[PDB]
Amino acid sequence: SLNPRDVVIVDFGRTPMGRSKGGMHRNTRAEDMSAHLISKVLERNSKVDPGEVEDVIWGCVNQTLEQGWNIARMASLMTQIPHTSAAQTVSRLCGSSMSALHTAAQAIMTGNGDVFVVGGVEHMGHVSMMHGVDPNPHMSLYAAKASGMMGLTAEMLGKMHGISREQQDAFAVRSHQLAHKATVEGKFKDEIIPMQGYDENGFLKIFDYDETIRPDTTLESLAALKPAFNPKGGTVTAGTSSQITDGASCMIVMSAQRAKDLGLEPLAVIRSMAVAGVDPAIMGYGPVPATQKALKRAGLNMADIDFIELNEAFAAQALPVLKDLKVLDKMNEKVNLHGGAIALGHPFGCSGARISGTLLNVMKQNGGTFGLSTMCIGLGQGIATVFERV
Amino acid sequence: SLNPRDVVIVDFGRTPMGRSKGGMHRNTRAEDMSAHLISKVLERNSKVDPGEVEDVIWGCVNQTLEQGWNIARMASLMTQIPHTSAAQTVSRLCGSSMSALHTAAQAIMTGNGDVFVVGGVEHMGHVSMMHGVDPNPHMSLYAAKASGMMGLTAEMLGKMHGISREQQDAFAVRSHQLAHKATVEGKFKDEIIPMQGYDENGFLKIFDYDETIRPDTTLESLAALKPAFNPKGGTVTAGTSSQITDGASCMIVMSAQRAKDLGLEPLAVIRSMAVAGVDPAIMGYGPVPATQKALKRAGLNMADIDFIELNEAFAAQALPVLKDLKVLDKMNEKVNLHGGAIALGHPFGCSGARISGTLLNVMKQNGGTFGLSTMCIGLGQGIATVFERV
Amino acid sequence: MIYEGKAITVTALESGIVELKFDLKGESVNKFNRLTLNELRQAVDAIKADASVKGVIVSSGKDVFIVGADITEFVENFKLPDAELIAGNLEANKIFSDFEDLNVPTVAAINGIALGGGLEMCLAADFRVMADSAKIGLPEVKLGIYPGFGGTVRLPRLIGVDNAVEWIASGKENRAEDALKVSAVDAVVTADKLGAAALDLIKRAISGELDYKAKRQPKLEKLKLNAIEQMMAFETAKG
Ligand SMILES: CC(=O)SCCNC(=O)CCNC(=O)[C@H](O)C(C)(C)COP(=O)(O)OP(=O)(O)OC[C@H]1O[C@@H](n2cnc3c(N)ncnc32)[C@H](O)[C@@H]1OP(=O)(O)O
Ligand SMILES: CC(=O)SCCNC(=O)CCNC(=O)[C@H](O)C(C)(C)COP(=O)(O)OP(=O)(O)OC[C@H]1O[C@@H](n2cnc3c(N)ncnc32)[C@H](O)[C@@H]1OP(=O)(O)O
Ligand SMILES: CCCCCCCCOCCOCCOCCOCCOCCO
Ligand SMILES: [Hg+2]
Ligand SMILES: [Hg+2]
């Protein structure tokens, strides 16, 4: 059965993904976006009392301006969550959100709280990814300065595994294709929390779909794009790279015991967690070391996993990871079935929990038992989580 | 005895505290300051293999510039810690460093790593506390904008508990007095990691003491100071407020099992942890709700605690907390025996683990069995940890 | 004095500390021409032979620290057959290396411009204290060449591949401020305190407060970078 202290995911909710460049969230702050989301998710789960929330752990990377000073607490204060609850912001670059979930999970397992709210956010429109970045000169004495430029790390991982321009463009076409399909078929209806935004004309209205998706993306349209990081020989382009998006993700997590008491059916249960490091230069490879450690902790083999969510940082880093994870031939059967970051965007702080949320819904919809969410992390890291639907 | 998964603190190390305004660390980056410290602490504990470090959890608040993009990983990369290890940066404002410790601890308890490096940093000289701060207008709909100004919250907590100007200045005089005494008597010799810095003339040399301490601080000199936050009626001054400092703190943490194997004597063991929230306006009161929750989890009473470390944000918030914690009359016997933030400074990211480190050494030097480190957190929170010397 | 030449002098100071000063008598600047290199050889051997020496401070008596030799000698030198040119440089480098291998702490007091060979001399020391008004850099690429006196060896091991490449491939002059940030230098002070700062620093090295051996070590071994990080760094640099 489920032990009292096992970690249960009660529900998952995310905002519609908006284009940072003039998109739907252009007039919405990161704190407000986070509060609104938290508020709505808690509203759909009326049996979970906000006062019971021990901690609000939020993932966010560029913590300055709208996102500085512990945005997790700033957002909580504008929610039905009482002042008596705590809140902390976590940063592990791309994996911030997943780390948020792990910290709450671990807190639940050790008896330091029963109910938590995790998630993350990143409004790249208001706090661009290169905003306030000050390279440390001394770093060049231990690693390559170029390792800090994600695009170049994709180029390197790609050349090293021989991922062609065609292979990358194909993955991208599939991503938009599958994201659009899922949208149209209402596969994102349960996880997407409708939200107010603005259209190109500044008109106020509600959005319940991801703007980022581009259904008109074909091999032909992508072939016309030029390399984005290596003018002479590069294969990575804007079309096969994750988008600059504005978004937030959220999850209600609690001990199994509390879930039993409240009489609510778990969306899933956590079976294992893991982080790991790799060289900064090939950060995109982070998922394989992390996934291996997590699978071992879960007592499972890659084959036991029914569905996989691998963040699509770059097709150039996703494809190699899938091959080395030994599931490339199983791609269309269990990998990013509803599209990925190339079509859905990669708002740093938000992604960790986001792909995990989408995974849970993919598992629910396709009768999966075990799921794996994993992603590469800038500056050489990988993080992974194993979920079980029981 | 100690269960295999109990959390052990192998060692503690901190940098000499420097004045942010033209101080010793004026030419040292936050990442380098963090790396150097981690390197030295690992060097004193040769039996702990850097390759075994699962995660480097670092606390830091204003994460932009030198402190942005997961400074925990940036610092780790310039250490003997391998690329295979992971790293994340934690933010819970003033309590960031203590949360870092809690996360690693909880990781150890659940079998998700055996050896961790925790700590934190804040270089307020390079990243001032008000740098990149963008108040959210919508916040005023739920809380008072003034709650974001720590000084005013001190004024409010003080008026509410009737803490006089005299009582506050007295605490401050005691703080410098006790910090200086501890310095002179070499009571900080074990925890302070000597480090390179610059004097007023730019001359390079090593510092092994805290510049922040001002032995010439008397009731007379403090009485001459003017209110810093409330011109007409205020009682809080710069003399009774924590200083703007540059500093880093660090700890090596690991399962008791691993400590047993490696044959190394624990500096202390964690018995309980806890965070809690209070209204933003009286954030300084955070320690009492947190300390109560932690004491209950530790199965102890405030009386069972031999030594206490309460971060000195403002004398105005420290005194009320001590009274309501019911240990004011026990102050000179067990509270901040080696001085506090008023004399040692309060580098946000670094403080949590710092006061905890100083606590352990206070306990070791005075034969204490149980210790409590706790602090208030901006925007209404409190955090606490109970340590046991066994 | 310990050594008295026409370009270099080695005068004894307090506590066994010795000062090797560059002052090319009759000329407006210091530069590594044939004469100076030969005298450095002698000054080094003199110090290497004086067992009473406890530390060395390298300074300049001119407005500049040390600049490049006359373009004229560059032209001549580059006409020589590869074997001779390389043998001549091997010999020059042997001097700087010997100064670097002194079993005593060394500090370079950069009072003014230190370009090419001048900077290379500084890189050979354990510590470098620079006046906030001075400038340093390796302009070799301007002449179609690159550092020939250990510059490509020492700079990368001192400030990191990316930064060394930036300095060498551009040959730009670097201000005190920037030199400190990349750690090409260890301290920046006003012109009036240069002497005192160098004297103060040397004493801290002698007392053991500063581990001069550990500070020197990095330029006597392989880079710290991974095979992986190396590839990333060099390939992007070339690109
Ligand atoms: C570890 C991890 O998991 S995280 C990985 C981190 N990834 C990232 O940070 C993403 C990196 N991406 C970037 O930095 C930027 O998006 C860049 C550099 C790739 C592109 O930005 P810019 O330099 O501004 O160029 P630009 O935005 O114009 O490029 C987009 C162009 O491609 C076109 N394009 C993009 N995707 C598509 C597509 N699917 N189909 C057709 N055209 C497309 C756009 O129409 C646009 O062309 P336009 O200007 O004519 O409208
Ligand atoms: C929630 C938590 O855990 S922590 C809360 C965070 N803490 C804070 O926000 C307070 C931090 N302090 C500050 O921000 C600043 O010190 C302030 C705003 C209080 C005052 O700043 P300023 O207006 O610039 O005044 P300033 O800092 O220059 O100092 C005022 C004078 O008092 C003097 N002074 C300060 N402390 C002392 C002291 N202990 N004894 C004697 N003189 C003192 C200073 O030397 C200065 O005199 P000087 O100018 O001749 O040198
Ligand atoms: C950055 C280093 C610059 C080195 C360039 C050398 C040009 C400067 O001329 C100074 C001469 O000393 C350099 C050593 O010369 C090498 C060859 O020595 C043989 C000279 O042949 C003359 C025999 O009489
Ligand atoms: Hg990234
Ligand atoms: Hg604060």
Short mmCIF file of C-alpha atoms in Angstrom, two decimals, chain C residues 24-187:
data_model
loop_
_atom_site.label_atom_id
_atom_site.label_comp_id
_atom_site.label_asym_id
_atom_site.label_seq_id
_atom_site.Cartn_x
_atom_site.Cartn_y
_atom_site.Cartn_z
CA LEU C 24 68.25 51.91 -18.47
CA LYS C 25 70.74 54.75 -17.95
CA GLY C 26 70.84 57.14 -20.88
CA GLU C 27 67.50 56.01 -22.29
CA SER C 28 63.96 57.26 -21.69
CA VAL C 29 62.47 53.83 -21.01
CA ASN C 30 63.28 50.30 -19.92
CA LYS C 31 63.10 47.54 -22.53
CA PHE C 32 64.39 44.02 -23.03
CA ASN C 33 67.14 44.65 -25.52
CA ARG C 34 70.26 42.49 -25.58
CA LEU C 35 71.94 44.50 -22.82
CA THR C 36 69.07 44.34 -20.37
CA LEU C 37 68.45 40.62 -20.85
CA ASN C 38 72.15 39.96 -20.24
CA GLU C 39 72.09 42.10 -17.11
CA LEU C 40 68.96 40.36 -15.83
CA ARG C 41 70.85 37.09 -16.20
CA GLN C 42 73.60 38.54 -14.03
CA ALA C 43 71.24 40.12 -11.52
CA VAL C 44 69.38 36.83 -11.15
CA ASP C 45 72.60 34.87 -10.69
CA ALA C 46 73.81 37.44 -8.18
CA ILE C 47 70.62 37.09 -6.13
CA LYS C 48 70.63 33.33 -6.65
CA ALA C 49 74.14 33.35 -5.11
CA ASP C 50 73.48 35.71 -2.18
CA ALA C 51 72.20 33.35 0.54
CA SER C 52 71.18 36.30 2.71
CA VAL C 53 68.35 37.34 0.38
CA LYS C 54 64.88 36.77 1.87
CA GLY C 55 62.78 38.34 -0.88
CA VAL C 56 62.88 40.36 -4.10
CA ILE C 57 60.99 43.45 -5.26
CA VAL C 58 61.15 44.28 -8.97
CA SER C 59 60.67 47.95 -9.74
CA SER C 60 61.36 50.62 -12.33
CA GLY C 61 63.19 53.93 -12.17
CA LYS C 62 61.48 55.35 -15.28
CA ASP C 63 57.96 56.67 -15.88
CA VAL C 64 57.08 53.36 -17.51
CA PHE C 65 57.74 49.92 -16.05
CA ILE C 66 59.11 48.04 -19.07
CA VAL C 67 58.06 48.29 -22.71
CA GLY C 68 59.08 46.36 -25.82
CA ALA C 69 62.51 46.42 -27.46
CA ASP C 70 63.20 48.59 -30.51
CA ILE C 71 61.28 47.43 -33.55
CA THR C 72 64.70 47.42 -35.20
CA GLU C 73 65.86 44.41 -33.18
CA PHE C 74 62.62 42.60 -33.98
CA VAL C 75 63.45 42.84 -37.69
CA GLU C 76 66.99 41.55 -37.18
CA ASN C 77 66.02 38.72 -34.83
CA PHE C 78 63.37 37.47 -37.26
CA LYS C 79 65.92 37.16 -40.07
CA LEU C 80 67.91 34.56 -38.14
CA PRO C 81 67.39 30.88 -38.97
CA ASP C 82 64.65 29.17 -36.94
CA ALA C 83 67.21 27.20 -34.92
CA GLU C 84 69.03 30.34 -33.80
CA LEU C 85 65.90 32.35 -33.06
CA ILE C 86 64.41 29.53 -31.00
CA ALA C 87 67.73 28.98 -29.20
CA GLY C 88 67.95 32.67 -28.39
CA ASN C 89 64.43 32.66 -26.96
CA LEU C 90 65.09 29.46 -25.05
CA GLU C 91 67.94 31.35 -23.39
CA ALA C 92 65.87 34.45 -22.60
CA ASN C 93 63.07 32.34 -21.15
CA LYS C 94 65.61 30.49 -19.02
CA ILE C 95 66.33 33.80 -17.31
CA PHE C 96 62.68 34.56 -16.47
CA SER C 97 62.15 30.96 -15.35
CA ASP C 98 65.19 31.17 -13.07
CA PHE C 99 63.75 34.34 -11.58
CA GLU C 100 60.47 32.49 -11.20
CA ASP C 101 62.26 29.56 -9.51
CA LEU C 102 64.01 31.75 -6.91
CA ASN C 103 63.56 29.98 -3.57
CA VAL C 104 62.44 33.34 -2.23
CA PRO C 105 59.23 35.45 -2.57
CA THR C 106 59.12 37.91 -5.47
CA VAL C 107 56.90 40.92 -6.20
CA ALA C 108 56.66 43.15 -9.26
CA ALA C 109 55.87 46.80 -8.57
CA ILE C 110 54.15 48.08 -11.70
CA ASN C 111 54.47 51.85 -11.63
CA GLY C 112 53.70 52.47 -15.29
CA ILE C 113 53.27 50.93 -18.72
CA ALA C 114 54.29 47.27 -18.86
CA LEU C 115 53.86 45.89 -22.39
CA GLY C 116 54.99 42.65 -24.01
CA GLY C 117 58.31 41.63 -22.55
CA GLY C 118 57.63 44.07 -19.75
CA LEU C 119 54.47 42.27 -18.73
CA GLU C 120 56.15 38.90 -19.25
CA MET C 121 58.75 39.91 -16.65
CA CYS C 122 55.90 40.71 -14.25
CA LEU C 123 54.19 37.38 -14.90
CA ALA C 124 57.42 35.70 -13.83
CA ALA C 125 57.05 37.08 -10.30
CA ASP C 126 54.92 35.61 -7.52
CA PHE C 127 52.92 38.79 -6.88
CA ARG C 128 52.16 41.96 -8.81
CA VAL C 129 51.17 45.29 -7.27
CA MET C 130 50.07 47.93 -9.74
CA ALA C 131 49.62 51.71 -9.68
CA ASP C 132 46.05 52.71 -10.50
CA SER C 133 47.34 54.87 -13.35
CA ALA C 134 49.43 52.19 -15.06
CA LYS C 135 48.54 49.90 -17.97
CA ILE C 136 49.63 46.40 -18.95
CA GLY C 137 49.11 44.18 -21.97
CA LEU C 138 50.64 41.98 -24.66
CA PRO C 139 50.57 43.77 -28.05
CA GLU C 140 52.60 41.07 -29.84
CA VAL C 141 49.70 40.23 -32.20
CA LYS C 142 50.00 43.76 -33.59
CA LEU C 143 53.32 42.69 -35.09
CA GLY C 144 51.95 39.40 -36.43
CA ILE C 145 53.46 37.37 -33.60
CA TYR C 146 52.48 36.56 -30.01
CA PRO C 147 54.09 36.54 -26.53
CA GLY C 148 57.55 34.96 -26.76
CA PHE C 149 58.81 35.15 -23.18
CA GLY C 150 56.37 32.82 -21.45
CA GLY C 151 53.35 35.03 -22.02
CA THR C 152 51.28 32.26 -23.60
CA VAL C 153 52.40 30.00 -20.79
CA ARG C 154 51.99 32.16 -17.72
CA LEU C 155 48.96 34.34 -18.49
CA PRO C 156 46.61 31.38 -19.16
CA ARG C 157 47.67 29.64 -15.98
CA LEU C 158 47.24 32.87 -14.01
CA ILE C 159 44.00 34.41 -15.26
CA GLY C 160 42.36 31.59 -17.21
CA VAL C 161 42.20 30.56 -20.87
CA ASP C 162 39.30 32.81 -21.93
CA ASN C 163 40.89 35.90 -20.43
CA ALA C 164 44.42 35.11 -21.61
CA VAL C 165 43.10 34.59 -25.16
CA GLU C 166 41.24 37.90 -24.99
CA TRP C 167 44.40 39.72 -23.96
CA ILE C 168 46.74 37.97 -26.38
CA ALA C 169 44.44 37.88 -29.43
CA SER C 170 43.59 41.59 -29.04
CA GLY C 171 46.84 42.95 -27.61
CA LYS C 172 44.84 45.68 -25.88
CA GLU C 173 46.24 47.70 -23.00
CA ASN C 174 44.48 46.92 -19.73
CA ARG C 175 43.81 49.41 -16.94
CA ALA C 176 44.64 48.68 -13.30
CA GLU C 177 40.96 48.15 -12.53
CA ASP C 178 40.48 45.45 -15.17
CA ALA C 179 43.83 43.80 -14.44
CA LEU C 180 42.73 43.30 -10.83
CA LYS C 181 39.37 41.85 -11.84
CA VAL C 182 41.01 39.08 -13.91
CA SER C 183 43.77 38.71 -11.29
CA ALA C 184 46.56 39.53 -13.72
CA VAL C 185 47.57 41.68 -10.76
CA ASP C 186 46.99 41.19 -7.00
CA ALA C 187 46.59 44.72 -5.68
#
